[PDB]
Every structure is written in structure tokens, then in C-alpha cells.
């Protein structure tokens, strides 16, 4: 069953990619510190907050995630608000502070 794709040749991976091609977001740990996070594929705020959950050993119901200054759902995505690559997220102690 002859497929051309497996025999088309021209295989390889050239450096057709730049460092700032992807996305970058800083989730300012709410203590006067800010850790650089990064987005590679289309990945909404969900993984940005969960990797943070796993990072501090405390999940997102215990860290209110505000981005562009305003808390919201992770499924809202960055560009949907108008702010993207170079943006920041702030996680405060729980949703109601307690």
C-alpha cells in the first residue's frame, strides 16, 4: 500500500523557529517575587495555574488567579482579553482570602 509520505524524503528539522515565537507569562508569586512561566502551544490559563498549583503544593481554589489585574476562569485564554505574551498572573490566598 504505497504511501508517498514515508518515502518523500526531505526529512529533517531546520532551525525554523525563534525564541520569542511562543508565549510567556509571569505568575507573580504574591510575596514580592515573580516566576517566569511560558506558553508553547495554544494553552489557556488552566495549565498556567495548575503547574503553579503543583509547584507550591497548593491548588487553585487556594490560590485566586488574577490576570491583567482581574481574576477570571482559566478557560478564558489570554488573547481573548487583549493582553498576551508578556502578561502576568497574580495568585492570592484562596478565592475569598480564606
Experimental method: NMR
Is residue 65 within 8 A of residue 37, CB to CB? The reply is: no
Q: In what order do the strands lie in the sheet with 87-93?
A: 35-39, 23-28, 87-93, 63-67, 70-71
Q: Rounded to whole angstroms, what are the CA distances from 85 to 23, 58, 68, 92, 96?
A: 5, 25, 12, 22, 28
Query: Where does residue 77 fall: left (phi above 0), alpha (psi -120 to 50 degrees), or beta otherwise?
Result: left
Is residue 49 within 8 A of residue 89, CB to CB? The reply is: yes
The sign one gets for the Cα dihedral 71, 72, 75, 80 is negative
> Closest Cα to residue 23, out of 72, 73, 84, 76?
84
Residues in contact with 38: Cβ distance below 8 Å, sequence separation at least 6, in sequence order: 22, 23, 24, 25
β-strands 23-28, 87-93 pairing: parallel
Residues 52 and 64: their CA atoms lie apart, in Å, by 11
Amino acid at each position: 500500500m504505497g504511501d508517498d509520505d514515508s518515502a518523500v524524503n526531505n526529512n529533517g528539522s531546520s532551525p525554523v523557529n525563534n525564541q520569542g515565537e511562543h508565549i510567556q507569562v509571569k505568575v507573580r508569586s504574591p510575596d514580592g517575587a515573580e516566576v517566569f512561566f511560558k506558553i508553547k502551544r495554544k494553552t489557556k490559563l488552566e495549565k498556567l495555574m495548575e503547574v503553579y498549583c503543583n509547584r507550591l503544593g497548593q491548588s487553585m481554589e487556594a490560590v485566586r488567579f488574577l490576570y491583567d489585574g482581574d481574576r477570571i476562569h482559566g478557560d478564558n485564554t489570554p488573547e481573548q482579553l487583549g493582553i498576551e505574551d508578556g502578561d502576568v498572573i497574580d495568585a492570592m490566598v484562596q478565592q475569598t482570602g480564606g
